[PDB]
Symmetry: D2
Subunit: 410 residues, 4 copies
Amino acid sequence: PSLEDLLFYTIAEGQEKIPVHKFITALKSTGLRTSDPRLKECMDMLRLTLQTTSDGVMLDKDLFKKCVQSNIVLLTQAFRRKFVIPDFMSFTSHIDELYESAKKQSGGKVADYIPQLAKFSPDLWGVSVCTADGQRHSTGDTKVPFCLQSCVKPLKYAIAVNDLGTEYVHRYVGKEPSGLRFNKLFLNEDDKPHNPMVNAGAIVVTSLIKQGVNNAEKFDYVMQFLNKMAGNEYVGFSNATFQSERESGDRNFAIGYYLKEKKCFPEGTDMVGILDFYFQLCSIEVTCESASVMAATLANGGFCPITGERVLSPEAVRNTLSLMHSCGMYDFSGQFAFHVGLPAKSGVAGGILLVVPNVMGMMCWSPPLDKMGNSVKGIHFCHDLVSLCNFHNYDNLRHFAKKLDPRREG
Amino acid sequence: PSLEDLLFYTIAEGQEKIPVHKFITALKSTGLRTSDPRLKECMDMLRLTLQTTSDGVMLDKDLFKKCVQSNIVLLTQAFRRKFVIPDFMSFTSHIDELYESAKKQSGGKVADYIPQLAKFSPDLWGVSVCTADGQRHSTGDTKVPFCLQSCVKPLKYAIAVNDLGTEYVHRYVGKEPSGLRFNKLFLNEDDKPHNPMVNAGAIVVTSLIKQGVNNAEKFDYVMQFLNKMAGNEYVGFSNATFQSERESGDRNFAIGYYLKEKKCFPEGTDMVGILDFYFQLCSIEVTCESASVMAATLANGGFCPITGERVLSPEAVRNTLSLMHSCGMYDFSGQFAFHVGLPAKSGVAGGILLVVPNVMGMMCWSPPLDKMGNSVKGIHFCHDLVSLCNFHNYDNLRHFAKKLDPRREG
Amino acid sequence: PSLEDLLFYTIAEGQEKIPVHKFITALKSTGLRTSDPRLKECMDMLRLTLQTTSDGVMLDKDLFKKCVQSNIVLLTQAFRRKFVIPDFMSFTSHIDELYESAKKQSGGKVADYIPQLAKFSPDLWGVSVCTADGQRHSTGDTKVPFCLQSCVKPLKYAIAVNDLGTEYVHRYVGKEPSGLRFNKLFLNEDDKPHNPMVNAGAIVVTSLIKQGVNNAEKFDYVMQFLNKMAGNEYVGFSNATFQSERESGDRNFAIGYYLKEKKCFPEGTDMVGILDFYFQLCSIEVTCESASVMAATLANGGFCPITGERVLSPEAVRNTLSLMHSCGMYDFSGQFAFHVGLPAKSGVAGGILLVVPNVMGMMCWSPPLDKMGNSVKGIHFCHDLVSLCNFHNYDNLRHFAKKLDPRREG
Amino acid sequence: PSLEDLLFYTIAEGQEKIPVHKFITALKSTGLRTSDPRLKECMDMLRLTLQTTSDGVMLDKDLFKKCVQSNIVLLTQAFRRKFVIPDFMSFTSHIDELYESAKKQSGGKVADYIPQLAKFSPDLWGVSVCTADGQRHSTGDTKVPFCLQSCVKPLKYAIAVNDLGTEYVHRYVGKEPSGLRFNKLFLNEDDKPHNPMVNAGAIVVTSLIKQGVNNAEKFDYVMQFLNKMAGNEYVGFSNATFQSERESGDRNFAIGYYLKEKKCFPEGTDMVGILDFYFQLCSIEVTCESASVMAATLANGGFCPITGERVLSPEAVRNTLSLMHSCGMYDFSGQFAFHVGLPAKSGVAGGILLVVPNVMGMMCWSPPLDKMGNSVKGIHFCHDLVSLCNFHNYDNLRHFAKKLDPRRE
Ligand SMILES: CC(=O)Nc1nnc(N[C@@H]2CCN(c3nnc(NC(C)=O)s3)C2)s1
Ligand SMILES: CC(=O)Nc1nnc(N[C@@H]2CCN(c3nnc(NC(C)=O)s3)C2)s1
């Protein structure tokens, strides 16, 4: 027997030669993108073959073997329906149905405190999925850039804990939700910020990363880190958003001097420079598609699912998911964890970074926020997703009533 | 083919007839107890047969089938290592190690609030495990009865949500932790108690169960419900503990009058009668073993693992586990959620009810409490357990660093 | 020389004999009532002579001498304009003017929680004045009984401090206002009630008076005090108000149990008996006239102005006025202290006990309350009164701009 | 009759002529100082005559009249013992006794967060009195300059209310104590600072004064105002303290940005410039003597007692005294109002501005603070003062037990 050959028979279906487009179509229906970085060798060999043998686009067993051999393990997992969601085409038709239903929730107000979020349409709406195996689906406006805003807070906390360790980080920042109306206090009773998901805690965490290097390199270093998280998909930067947040962030300067006074930063911190860095991190741009891969790295124990790259330690990913669970959705965190039961993080640009641990990462984006700061269409979507599927942190994988389990077959 | 007979060969082990103790010994090592309620028919058949032939008590092929036929599906899974923890004997060896290391943490103070919890010794320490498949293990004082105290709160919340539904129950009680800076208030700003896991919230939940029938019938009904939850293992009642709670609950009467004044009860509530019921519910008695089965029902979507009976709705089991996650360990809940990442609920007699969703339920019991009200030995055990195994709610099942995964074979 | 003689000449106006009605009229215009207890002997002899000498009604010097001889010292201050408010007839004309302007403020809502406070009319409005010299004036419904409610709180604190001393009393009760965003906590950070003017503070103070005797004698003992303070004018009791206060005090029972749990009462306290005592003290009845004398006793360093009797120690009167100043008007205390600057205490029956130190005491009563619990017409009157006269705690006696100073002549 | 003559005889005591030193001694014992601004003409006339007749410096009726005639009403009130405290020398003898007992209270910590308060001694201690009539007494270190710090807060509040009115001022700042469980929030529920006596409230009040003018002119105007309040006694400015407060007011910059975000300032406010102004106001220097005169203006309805000038509206002085009562001694405010019952304001340099309305103004100064920020010797002194004299706001002037009433004979 031979593994390149058994797959050949699986697809050849008693026929002699495989039309190459027939191979591509079977590949895509698994959820894999033909541009998947782990498939470069296979696609490079196929494109070359349609040059070298420009008569009739047929693969025999000998030719099939040489094209798929380098990436054979992944292709068998895809074709032997071993991915986390085996019937991916079924699942995405549900995602599309939830997407369309959320689309009808036309309420909410686009954040307009700087002229740059004001220029976004209320009608922009996109959802992107990347599973722990790299299966991809997008619907709506998933290639429109927008800033991460507070959706960067879990990412940079994950980075700090990865590089510095649990102990160090949490000498400077707490690990609990504050209390449904301690939203106005910057510090807990230990004179630490409550958690990394509130502005004061993120500001403290911004001040822990890559100490002793200047702001240009600190930024470069985080960007390089986010690029790996996103499997090298779009990660960008809005200088415009940066200028407007720095010229209008009185509240963040208030946090900054308060934290300095109460000595909350590591020694030798230049607070106002740290505030500058913080404004930059919030103006990093993503798309729905690229950001979904970042959340999938967090769903996948810190390995980027579309590259196989270890990005973050398991410790960083667990802490981040733990604090996204209780602290990630502003004053709605407690209601969200109860009804949705998934780690998620919202930002004022209307994004929600969603993690279904061991299954998939998602980014939903609709700019209109509700009175709590959370995107109306996104929130509506994340209730539906958990109401349809047994993805709630405390659903049971064996007894789950009328809910759907996309990880399973029949 | 025949499943009773291919099973016979796996155990007969090329030989002709099976000595019955060889079958019993093999059975026990899967984790199953000979007393498993789902095995009665088979055990009844052995009881008949080992009566008939006290010489040549060995089971031939025909006779083995005759005893095992009725429970063959369950015996096949046990013997083909299909249970959630396949190598259960190794697992209990780690449980026994965690037990001994917790056993040496001699700190803490026995609650000295009543003469009935005061009469318990600091040296009592017990841990009991029941998986979602009914596999059982105990070490220490796992058959010593003790009162549930606040470990009854998730159970009575479970029943209430089971009988009335999420929406109704939460007209009366919130669903978030208050904040370690609002542990002293009885009501949130919506004038409901913060969650069901605190005294004010539990008192409100007591008032929703079986309204309009008297308290004698309500107690019977809760006991019958707890009986299904523990698969009819030990559930009792301490009148002594009840009397001492009834003369020592000034704080509970303060709560009761405050809730009545603010109209927090359903109409037709007799507040002073509800407090009496509440004091009884806190004096329901369990062992580590029976209570471990109660937790396993919560690990298993509301189906009792040693009987197969559907006891609680999934909605009931999900809400309860969500609120044990953030509110179950007094002021230590936020730290416990971060570091342990399991639903747990502690009580003042030294019990900690632990749920590992889709894996197991446990009860740890040591009366000596720490300064926050939590069992010292219990708390220490629950750290080691998650430090050893990837049972943390947000550990990754694929990349998990140095931890052990008992669900795996190799 | 002789005082009976020059006083005789003062009234005689060069004439030989004084018509007795002329003496009565001059006396009344000073503010004194002919029924003033300090004038009994003089009035007894005048009435006696209008019997013995139905030939008259003229008084020559010797007969005037024998009637006034007993009360001559006070009659001289009355007639030589030595009282705190010399031109008393002018002053009452201004009181009447303020009464009428307050009379037109028809807003507010009568207290409606028990059947006995609901039954008081919005049209009742009365103001009664008693200076520190016994000068009296009334306007409106000043002889209608009503319950003191929280206006008894300063009185019983005064008794407490009088009998036990500042240090002892304030081991159990604080001396500060809670903070306008702390109306809902029963205890300050030292686990004492904030001050004696809140319900929990009054409940603690009720428990300090005449410890170890039963409730019947404790009550009599306090009533006996209120009689002396009111110069033996009407002090009564509403059993009806008492019964409904005890059937509607869920919150007060909530306070009592909370206070017992936190060990806030003196040892040997029967908390539930103390609550009944407190409900009794709140149903003590006065009129505006008798209660104005109680306030005048507080304006007078603890001496009753219409009897000359020492009732309360100065230390007791000072502490009380300090806490009526900052804590006396529910959530309006800080605004009232800023804009009115007078010691005052409001109650839910529509009373406001007002003290102008060294000048007079007052009682205003109009049942309609405002959203903070304070009598609407009462509040309006005390603003106008201090806008008219330099009575504000921190007005100046030399420079006072547009204001009138009734202590002055021309 | 003649007013200069009846006074001349009371002082002459039936004798020929009054020796000039004998008239001066009688003056000093009333409490008045020979430098009292309201006595300048009489003193100017005395210095003129002390040249003409440089030998036997006796004043006869005719010559005495020539010196006192211009200031006769005030000299008559002083010599007929019509002042608020008639036996002032008795009263000051008690002040000295309270001073010495407080001096033995050696505890507390000199504030050291800026090097300019660090450089002060723990043993500095002075008390100064100026009555509503200009009677003066000092004991201790009453001519040593020190910064006002938060004891300026009521003064600049008084100015704002004087110039802009109660309504306007309190559109921006509350009028209540927060509650000993709110000293850490900058804003009350209406998103105003709780009162003008806390830092966030004073920072806002700084922003109301003399708007639209630059900081140089704003400071000048407050100084000119303070000069009137203190009857032109010592008022200065410490540049050093200013530099250290501006380089270390991270908490104050935190307050400023928070207030800016919640839009608590009047339109067109330059916040960072307002903070600079605020640091300046807190580095104004006084002595116990000059500052005691400022407090006497507040005890006297806004009239400066040693000049007769109307300085503050009555509305300004009452509001100020009301909030000094409840908000003036940091977390000790509620305790101070209960046991002392006088408007007072303390600052971190160890000063306490004390007002007994209608009686006197006072300044106590000892740098060592207690754990709440209040001067230890000052706090001890004002407890003793009210334990001895019926000065508590809610003492009775008629029935006051064993206490002293310096207003009576
Ligand atoms: C919206 C809201 O706040 N609702 C409430 N729920 N419960 C409340 N107070 C109960 C009753 C009185 N208790 C307390 N008094 N004092 C305290 N604090 C301290 C330092 O002693 S706690 C406990 S208010
Ligand atoms: C109505 C209202 O809420 N008004 C407010 N005013 N000011 C606020 N917050 C400022 C800025 C953040 N500060 C604080 N953080 N943490 C604290 N307490 C502790 C124990 O750490 S105080 C102070 S909220």
